[PDB]
């Protein structure tokens, strides 16, 4: 059907807006705690699913011109009316709750979906349990699930949120009884359930018993009984009887968060499947297996990795082929530790090629990486805010460097280039000159192990160790065209190198390096029966993953 | 301004349409000769400028839900309402008059402008005086003016319309007193004014004075004066007195249509300013002057020309540079004989390169011209309708030819190629095989002079004359041209006499323009006139020539130093 809108629908909406702001042809007025809102019935019927029944049903409101609508905020109803009259919402970050409250009040489906998306995108660090209780009160399965997983991930690291105390039982039961608790130990959930019953007892003793049972035998074999003898109300006999029941039944099973194996995440591998360009796989140091990961964009490559102290994976920048009949994109992504997917985040402001992301003081710092190339000050850096979810410009780099590396030592930013090093102080937002290397090597990376930076490789086997407390560069030894990948494994400095000769196959083997010995002892030789060739542009980083969520990479020995 | 429409305005309009078709939330109903139209007041207020006052002014009609609106058609009001719930007008070609009438009654500006544009684009041949009286009834400056000029151009060739008889005086005065009458003689307007007052003699003797005076002294001859005298109602004395007054006063001046000089229209000339590539100029055979014309697209080139028997200029096809930071366009245009501009028309269906347009039986026939080709067949042709304003597909060419020429002789289509020729029968829509030339020459054109086709040039000076009644090709002579040169021949009819316009070019020599007079039985090109270089400059190589009548006052002379 022909529904042309060229200069017609916009003109109609502009005429309606003009009639609204001039108070013309209005036949209904909303009374909101003394505030008047003259409007029309047609717009309220086409926008809200409640006003259509308010103006159709032949009751009292039908003839009532002065309808007194209560339990609604003035500003929220005003923004809903102006959204109905112009189509633009222009929502902030503070009044989203009351907006959704009154949007669900009038079943206004479009603004409901808009606010639902805005809330599902903005579960950053703190409003998680709050918006989870919000979605529990206003049954919203979409928001409910994302918030559920978000809490399963972060709540099991703070378990002290002020909002977490005020939760309904069913929601707490769903949270605690789930097998998605990202906890490496079983006593933290026990004490967390405990403190949730240390603020409210006596009248709430039923909930106490329920959560106690939920904790299961794994955490029921603790001080739970003694703490209860201490806080139980007097003259309670059957309560001890029902508490003694919880010890032998109800399927004691292992949890999921304990499977936080410290593994080796790789990217841009040799797609086991021929013409496929690249793939992201993983390696297990202890399990001696090779797991795979899903490509974040599935077509874009040349990305940079970073791992926060909370074991989080991020991906920024990269280039994607234009697919006309490689363009650079500043998109951003984050790896899910359980869903084996990639949820995007706030993109960058500059399209970078192979950005070097560094985490420090809870902030992500992307140093260099072909920001735009044609900058007036070619040396610049853009940092990320993991809490506010925004990018903040900081003091630019002193000199323009290419194929550089950057690490973080002692809560400070350290970027390494051919021969120079600069310490970005995040507190004073300044760059202090550091020691210069006597050797000029590029195309190499550095590792931040302890309080020493180990710049390995370059063009080789150059081992130049730097210390922060000493501020000096020294050599240790030569590792016995190697592709070096220095990294931290089990609080012990190790390396992952691959050698390649003429008419010979590649071999993967990791060595154990000692500080005072200056020697790379043979730790483990990666057999080719489990791991195949990776390539040249592959990257390495240390991080904890889950074996059950991920899938093994099928490949013939 | 802060306002969107992406899936929010379209959704709102769809919800309004759903409420309308389901008869929901309706509070006003229109009664149109018994037919009911339940609708809303908001849409009628935002669409029409009359319904806003019908529903705003505190009145009995504002309160009445059963309003009885009269003097409006049911179908027109229905289409206006659906255009007020969908925006899709979907107007036909028949109900435009009543639709515009109802729109002017309801003061709906958007549909008014839409119908005004649709009417100003569709003044083809016949509804001219009708829609002119229509625009005189509903004051419409735009329609009024385009229709005025359209009548000044075509009315002065038929002067026998039935709607012309039914015209208001002021409109007839404006038409007749204007100096835009495209008439080569002054008696046609006189007899037209006569028959306008011959269907209403006696009854309308009041206008039989003003219209009589409008024709002026040029046609107020003693003969017609005395005729009207002996013809009037009896017992009329002062009427003869006021008629005798109209003979000596009121500024006898020459008209404009008489300046229909048979001139020589040209396209793609050597532009003077280096910022422009080509230009379209003209040449006067009798006045010995060089006039210019405005470029139809002002950037597109490689066009084809055609001249109807009614002296009309058309332009089809062509290529325009893409201006990225030559693409082919199937656009169409028409040259105004007085405004010195180009009004576009219905474009073609295929983007052609240098199309050959031929006029026959009132239809324009575009034969070949790279309509777009990439197969073994490809041979195709698209004809134009000057009356219905549309393109009609006909029997396609039998063989695929390039750099071909086509003319019209004895109301038949004749296209010429390297060596073959086919005659397309417009009555049966088929191609019949004709005679074959013994010489294989291309890159040449032909002229339709009388009952003989004169294929001149080709690669030269090949003069191959063909006759339709005889169906044979023969040679006549060789045009006298200087040796060591490459002549650019142009054959065209002028003053009912076959002539040629050729230019010779040598090495390290300048170009010379000269037209010769060719005789049929003599087989010789007598020196008719040598175009002096002091008035005409170089043209180029890809220039075209065609015969047509133009106006010197409307056009402008081309300034160039001798």
**In CATH, what number is assigned to the domain containing residue A305?**
2.120.10.80
DSSP A489-503: -SSSEEEEEEE--TT
- Is A210 inside a domain boundary? no
B230 token code pair? 């002996």
Query: How far is A210 from B260, CA to CA, in rounded Å?
Result: 107
Question: To which H or E segment does residue B68 belong?
Answer: strand B66-68
Query: How far is B130 from B123, CA to CA, in rounded Å?
Result: 10
Asked if residues A102 and A112 have their Cβ atoms less than 8 Å apart, the reply is no
Q: Is B365 helix (H, G, I), strand (E, B) or coil?
A: strand
Within 8 A by CB and 6+ apart from A244, the residues are none
Do B130 and B272 sit in the same domain of this protein?
A: no
∠ CA A310-A312-A314, nearest 5°, is: 145
- How many helices, marked H, and strands, marked E, lie in chain A? 14, 31
Phi, psi of A266 (to 5 degrees): -115, 160
Query: How far is A352 from A266, CA to CA, in rounded Å?
Result: 20
- Is A202 inside a domain boundary? no
Mutate to test the interface with B, among A3, A20, A21 (most CBs of B within 10 A): A3
End-to-end CA distance of chain B: 58
Query: What's A61's DSSP letter?
Result: T
Which ranges in B283-415 belong to alpha helices (H)?
none
Of A396, A430, A436, which is closest to residue A416 (Cα–Cα)? A436
Measure in Å the smallest separation between the Cα of B333 and chain A Cα atoms.
27
Give the CA count within 13 Å in the CB-facing half-sphere of B135. Answer: 23
Query: What's A411's DSSP letter?
Result: S
Which among B25, B88, B110 has the least Cβ separation from residue A41?
A: B25
Q: Which residue of A has its CA nearest to B54?
A: A25
End-to-end CA distance of chain A: 60
Q: Is B137 helix (H, G, I), strand (E, B) or coil?
A: helix
- Is A474 inside a domain boundary? yes
Chain B CB contacts of A56 under 8 Å are 24-25
Do B133 and B269 sit in the same domain of this protein?
A: no
Q: What is the CATH number of the domain that holds A62?
A: 3.30.710.10
- Is B233 inside a domain boundary? no
What was the experiment behind these coordinates? Answer: cryo-EM
Q: Which of B137, B168, B200 is the last residue of a domain?
A: B137
Do B129 and B266 sit in the same domain of this protein?
A: no
Of B351, B465, B377, B353, which is closest to residue B416 (Cα–Cα)? B465
Question: By residue range, what is the domain housing residue A54?
Answer: 6-137
DSSP A412-479: -EEEE-SS-EEEEETTTTEEEE----SS---S-EEEEETTEEEEE------EEEEETTTTEEEE----
Measure in Å the smallest separation between the Cα of A462 and chain B Cα atoms.
51
Do B132 and B268 sit in the same domain of this protein?
A: no
Query: How far is B332 from B322, CA to CA, in rounded Å?
Result: 18
Strands (E), B435-551: 445-449, 452-456, 463-467, 472-475, 491-494, 497-504, 512-519, 524-531, 544-550
- Cross-chain residue pair B87–A19, CB shorter than 8 Å: no
Task: Find residues 102-121 of chain B whose CB sits inside 8 Å of chain A.
Answer: 110
Per-residue b/e over B175-213, b at no fewer than 16 CB within 10 Å?
A: bbeeebbbbeebebbbebbbebbeeeeeeebebbbebbb
Per-residue b/e over A526-549, b at no fewer than 16 CB within 10 Å?
A: beeebbbebeeebbbbbbbbbeeb
Per-residue b/e over B533-545, b at no fewer than 16 CB within 10 Å?
A: eebbbebeeebbb
Which among A14, A25, A47 has the least Cβ separation from residue B3?
A: A14
Query: How far is B219 from B202, CA to CA, in rounded Å?
Result: 21
A407 token code pair? 């690490």
Q: Residues A176, A179, A180, A182: is their CA dihedral positive or negative?
A: positive
CA distances from B139 to B100, B117, B143, B165, B281 (A): 12, 15, 9, 20, 38
- Is B227 inside a domain boundary? no
Do B309 and B456 sit in the same domain of this protein?
A: yes
Within 8 A by CB and 6+ apart from B227, the residues are none
B260 token code pair? 């229909």
Query: How far is B423 from B409, CA to CA, in rounded Å?
Result: 10
- Is B422 inside a domain boundary? yes
Q: Which of A122, A137, A152 is the last residue of a domain?
A: A137
- Cross-chain residue pair B15–A88, CB shorter than 8 Å: no
Query: How far is B143 from B125, CA to CA, in rounded Å?
Result: 15
Measure in Å the smallest separation between the Cα of A113 and chain B Cα atoms.
13
- Cross-chain residue pair B55–A25, CB shorter than 8 Å: yes
> Which neighbouring-strand residues pair with B384?
B364, B391
Query: How far is B312 from B292, CA to CA, in rounded Å?
Result: 17
B170 touches chain A (CB under 8 A): no
A424 token code pair? 């970005």
Query: How far is B463 from A538, CA to CA, in rounded Å?
Result: 79
Would strands B445-449 and B452-456 be described as parallel, antiparallel, or unpaired?
antiparallel
Q: Residues B326, B330, B331, B332: is their CA dihedral positive or negative?
A: positive
Query: What's B65's DSSP letter?
Result: S
Within 8 A by CB and 6+ apart from B211, the residues are B169, B172, B173, B176, B193, B196, B197
Phi, psi of B73 (to 5 degrees): -85, 150
Q: Is B85 helix (H, G, I), strand (E, B) or coil?
A: helix
Of B235, B233, B175, B227, which is closest to residue B204 (Cα–Cα)? B233
Residue A326, number of CB atoms within 10 A of its CB: 12
Q: Which of B137, B157, B185 is the last residue of a domain?
A: B137
Give burial (CB, 10 Å; 0-12/13-18/19+) of B400: middle
Give burial (CB, 10 Å; 0-12/13-18/19+) of A509: middle
Rg (CA), chain B: 30
Rg (CA), chain A: 30
Give burial (CB, 10 Å; 0-12/13-18/19+) of B510: exposed
- Is B81 inside a domain boundary? yes
Number of domains in chain A: 2
- Is B131 inside a domain boundary? yes
CA distances from B35 to B39, B66, B68, B69, B78 (A): 13, 12, 10, 11, 10
Of A175, A171, A209, A215, which is closest to residue A191 (Cα–Cα)? A215
Q: Which residue of A has its CA nearest to B7?
A: A87
**Sheet strand arrangement including A493-499:** A486-488, A493-499, A507-514, A519-526
Per-residue b/e over A469-508, b at no fewer than 16 CB within 10 Å?
A: eeeebeebeebeeebbbbbbbeeebbbbbbeeeeeeeeeb
Residue A254, number of CB atoms within 10 A of its CB: 9
Place of tokens 């909930």: A207
Of B113, B206, B378, B293, which is closest to residue A8 (Cα–Cα)? B113
Query: How far is B292 from B283, CA to CA, in rounded Å?
Result: 8
To 10 degrees, the CA torsion angle through A476, A477, A482, A485? -30
Would strands A28-32 and A66-68 be described as parallel, antiparallel, or unpaired?
parallel
Chain B CB contacts of A90 under 8 Å are 2
Query: How far is A444 from A462, CA to CA, in rounded Å?
Result: 10
Chain A CB contacts of B19 under 8 Å are 45-46
B193 token code pair? 């004014």
∠ CA B112-B145-B556, nearest 5°, is: 135
Contacts of the segment B337-341: beta carbons below 8 A, 24+ positions apart: B337/B153, B337/B182, B337/B311, B337/B550, B337/B551, B337/B554, B338/B149, B338/B152, B338/B153, B338/B180, B338/B551, B338/B554, B339/B149, B339/B554, B340/B293, B340/B294, B340/B554, B340/B555, B340/B556, B341/B294
Residue B91, phi-psi category: left (phi > 0), alpha (psi -120 to 50), beta (remainder): beta
């Amino acid at each position: 059907e022909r529904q042309i809108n060229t200069e017609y629908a916009v003109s109609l909406l502009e005429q309606l807006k003009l009639f609204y702001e001039q108070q013309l042809f209005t036949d209904i007025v909303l009374i909101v705690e003394g505030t008047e809102f003259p409007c029309h019935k047609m717009v309220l019927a086409t926008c809200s699913s409640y006003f259509r029944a308010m103006f159709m049903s032949g009751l009292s409101e039908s003839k009532q011109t002065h309808v007194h609508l209560r339990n609604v905020d003035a500003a929220t109803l005003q923004i809903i009316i102006t959204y109905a009259y112009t189509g633009n919402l222009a929502m902030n970050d503070s009044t989203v709750e009351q907006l959704y409250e009154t949007a669900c009040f009038l079943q206004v489906e479009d603004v409901l979906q808009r606010c639902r998306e805005y809330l599902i995108k903005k579960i950053n660090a703190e409003n998680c349990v709050r918006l989870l209780s919000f979605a529990d009160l206003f049954s919203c399965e979409e928001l409910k699930q994302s918030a559920k997983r978000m809490v399963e991930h972060k709540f099991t690291a703070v378990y002290h949120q002020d909002a977490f105390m005020q939760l309904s039982h069913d929601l707490l039961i769903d949270i605690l009884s789930s097998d998605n608790l990202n906890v490496e130990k079983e006593e933290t959930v026990r004490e967390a359930a405990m403190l949730w019953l240390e603020y409210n007892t006596e009248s709430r003793s039923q909930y106490l018993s329920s959560v106690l049972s939920q904790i299961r035998i794994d955490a029921l074999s603790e001080v739970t009984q003694r703490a209860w003898f201490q806080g139980l109300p007097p003259n309670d006999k059957s309560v001890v009887v029902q508490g003694l029941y919880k010890s032998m039944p109800k399927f004691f099973k292992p949890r999921l968060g304990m499977t936080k194996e410290e593994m080796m995440i790789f990217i841009e591998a040799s797609s086991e499947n021929p013409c496929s360009l690249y793939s992201s796989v993983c390696y297990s140091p202890q399990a001696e297996k090779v797991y795979k990961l899903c490509s974040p964009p599935a077509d874009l490559h040349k990305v940079g990795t970073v791992v926060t102290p909370d074991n989080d994976i991020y991906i920024a920048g990269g280039q994607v082929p234009l697919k006309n009949t490689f363009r650079t994109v500043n998109c951003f992504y984050w790896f899910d530790a359980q869903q084996n997917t990639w949820f995007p985040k706030t993109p960058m402001l500059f399209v970078r090629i192979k950005p070097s992301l560094v985490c420090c003081e809870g902030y992500i710092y992307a140093i260099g990486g072909d920001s735009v190339g044609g900058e007036l000050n070619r040396r610049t850096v853009e940092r990320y805010d993991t809490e506010k979810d925004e990018w903040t410009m900081v003091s630019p780099l002193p000199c323009a460097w290419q194929w550089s590396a950057a690490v973080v030592v002692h809560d400070c930013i350290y970027v390494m280039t051919l021969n120079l090093m600069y310490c970005y102080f995040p507190r004073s937002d300044s760059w202090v000159e550091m020691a210069m290397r006597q050797t000029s090597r590029s195309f190499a990376s550095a590792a931040a192990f302890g309080d020493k930076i180990f710049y390995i490789g370059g063009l080789s086997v150059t081992v130049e160790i730097y210390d922060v407390n000493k501020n000096e560069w020294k050599m240790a030894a030569n590792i016995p065209d190697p592709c070096v990948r220095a990294v931290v494994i089990s609080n012990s400095l190790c390396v992952f190198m691959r050698e390649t000769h003429l008419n010979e196959r590649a071999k993967y083997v990791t060595y154990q390096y000692d500080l005072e010995l200056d020697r790379w002892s043979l730790r483990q030789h990666i057999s080719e029966r489990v791991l195949w060739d990776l390539g040249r542009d592959f990257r390495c980083t240390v991080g904890k993953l889950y074996p059950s969520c991920l899938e093994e990479s099928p490949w013939k020995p």
